[PDB]
């Protein structure tokens with residue numbers, strides 16, 4: 407069950423970025439974002455995931471202020487967690 411402030415499928419930014427709370431139901435292979443092979447990409451290893459926001463599998467994303475993403479999700483702004 408998603409938190410009340412989870413990013414949802416009719417959020418206009420979710421649509422533009424092709425966000426899905428489940429990376430296995432995403433277009434990460436088509437996007438081929440750099441940094442890791444696409445099958446290895448999800449929010450937990452993305453630079454914009456905020457691990458001090460949320461709880462459990464539902465964490466912050468800098469690009470979605472006031473909301474929570476799922477650590478197992480993905481979107482086209484995926485960027486390797488480098489620091």
Ligand code: SF4
Pocket residue numbers: 425448449450452453454455466467468469475479480481482483484485
């Ligand atoms: S920017 Fe990164 S953390 Fe935020 S939704 Fe997209 S893949 Fe997940």
